[PDB]
């Protein structure tokens, strides 16, 4: 039911025990050194 | 004003932004609180 301005599809792979790691605010080795998501973030995160 | 400090410094430094912004917005809501309280004692007194 909404209109986006643009959107950002961001793909990689990522093992199990740190899935919960993408998310604001967390605290970890992938939100620290290698993607981190901001705290006001607006969008989806999607696995498989 | 139930937040874990009433020094904001310590606040900051403890605690990261996605809880700490929590513990700051009570702080400012209390100030604000205090204040308003006090510019309208201070607007009653002065028409007296």
Redesign the interface.
Same mark, same amino acid.
């Given at each position: 039911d909404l209109c986006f301005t643009n959107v950002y599809a961001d793909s990689f792979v990522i093992r199990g025990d740190e899935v919960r790691q993408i998310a604001p605010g967390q605290t970890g080795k992938i939100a620290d050194y290698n993607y981190k998501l901001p705290d006001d973030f607006t969008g989806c995160v999607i696995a498989w | 004003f139930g937040a874990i400090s009433s020094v904001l410094n310590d606040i900051l430094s403890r605690l990261? &932004? &996605?809880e700490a912004?929590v513990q700051i917005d009570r702080l400012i809501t209390g100030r604000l609180q205090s204040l308003q309280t006090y510019v309208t004692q201070q607007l009653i007194r002065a028409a007296e």
């Open positions: - | 990261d &932004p &996605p912004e």
